[PDB]
């Protein structure tokens, strides 16, 4: 759907897990600071015993270049208080939980540089929607509850099909084509397709692929940024392939009546 | 200085405790959620014994209509578990804390509707600044550490002047002035100029005011937005008082060599 320039949404973390720490029975209140831009806020984390369990959720306002930093500071170790800080970055993690909940770990890098452990959470972004404040969820739990009432639409279709060398049987199943060797011979090579910016079939032939007998043409663009051109030698099969590779790629369960679950489907 | 058509700047919290609420011994983890437009949180709380101290800081880089909520979950009373929520207005406090710390009240209204408990709190107020984010303080505590080297310059003047009945014995200090019986009679109100309007001299004078021999008149606004009309029988005199009531309200000390103080004392 429409974006803003700088794309605006939501992102969702739960963090869960201080991993390969050995935290003491014995506790001093240890201050947990997060950072986003432009905010700051400092907790008091008590851990019983020594657990090493998190149970902290956030919900940002957020944009394309957001960048939360989780510092630990003055944890025991079984006395001995070591500090540590964990960067997440959403422009590493932005894709594998776009619509969908995505465990990740973060390493918490020691003061002044080795790691001390790994921070684990649980993040999910979604974009921004024309829809009020008071319709959307405030956690991730809440989130993916509600989005599991988004299902995937069934997406098949194979042929053959020229790709820069030679024709392939391309297989595409929902967002996700895989190039095959003869008809099923043997699985080439896979290009996700991306679920932002559209295929447009193309006007300009190249000089090589006008003599092989190619008439129309195919371009596609995954999530990684990354091209591929797509050629056929007959017209109706361009305007057949483009026609179900940029299909809704999602639809909504019946009976949600979810405002926001709306407008994420028509996002898509 | 210069504010965005909706003045931005930055708000710092600092939760302090919980009153009238008796915390049981026996724990269960009580979820904080603080709630601020676009953004949300949620904490676990966990108070070794009945500790009604809380020690958790906040800084929102904020707006003027700002207003954050502080829920908490399920506490425990000496089991009976009860269920709050505490907001804090800016436009409430934003005149309170403007550059200075702020102890301030906020109830925890009961779930459903009465009142709790009270849940104490520290804020102070900064305005925005053109000057870099790694260059302003994180916390509340660090905020008031560098605003004790801003000094409040000494501002005394008095005299005789008209204003809207008779003429007073006006005694200005700092930025506050009062209205005094004869010379030093009896103080009959007080009108605290505002650190962001400026006073200005009059040109329209009253059909009245003409004929009591007044020729130059001052305007001047206070920090709740109402306005007063000052007026003086003499020219040389309603140069004077404005030249010395809309002077620097605020200096630094020597030797501070921090950015953020320099432009929050040239903003006033």
Do not use: M
């Given at each position: 759907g429409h974006m803003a320039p700088l794309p605006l949404g939501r992102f969702y973390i739960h963090l869960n897990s201080i991993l390969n720490i050995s935290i003491s029975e014995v506790h001093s209140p240890i201050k947990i600071i997060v950072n986003t831009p432009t905010q700051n806020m400092q907790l008091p984390w008590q851990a019983v015993?020594?657990?090493?369990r998190l149970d902290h959720d956030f919900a940002f306002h957020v944009d394309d270049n957001f960048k939360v930093s989780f510092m630990f500071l003055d944890i025991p170790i079984e006395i001995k208080k070591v500090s540590g800080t964990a960067t997440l970055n959403l422009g590493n993690v932005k894709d594998s939980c776009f619509g969908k909940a995505f465990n990740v770990e973060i390493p918490i890098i020691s003061r002044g540089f080795r790691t001390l452990g790994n921070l684990t959470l649980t993040c999910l972004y979604i974009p921004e929607l024309?829809?009020?404040?008071?319709?959307?969820?405030?956690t991730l739990e809440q989130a993916t509850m509600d989005l599991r009432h988004v299902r995937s639409n069934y997406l098949y279709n194979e042929g053959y099909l020229y790709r820069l060398i030679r024709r392939r049987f391309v297989v595409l199943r929902s967002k996700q084509l895989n190039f095959y060797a003869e008809?099923?011979?043997?699985?080439?090579d896979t290009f996700q397709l991306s679920k932002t910016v559209v295929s447009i079939p193309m006007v300009n032939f190249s000089e090589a692929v006008s003599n092989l007998g190619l008439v129309a043409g195919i371009l596609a663009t995954s999530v990684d940024r990354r091209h591929v051109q797509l050629f056929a030698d007959s017209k109706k099969v361009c305007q057949k392939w483009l026609q179900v590779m940029n299909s809704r790629s999602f639809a909504l369960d019946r009976g949600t009546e979810k405002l926001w679950l709306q407008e994420y489907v028509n996002f898509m």
């Open positions: 015993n020594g657990n090493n024309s829809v009020p404040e008071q319709e959307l969820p405030f008809k099923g011979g043997q699985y080439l």
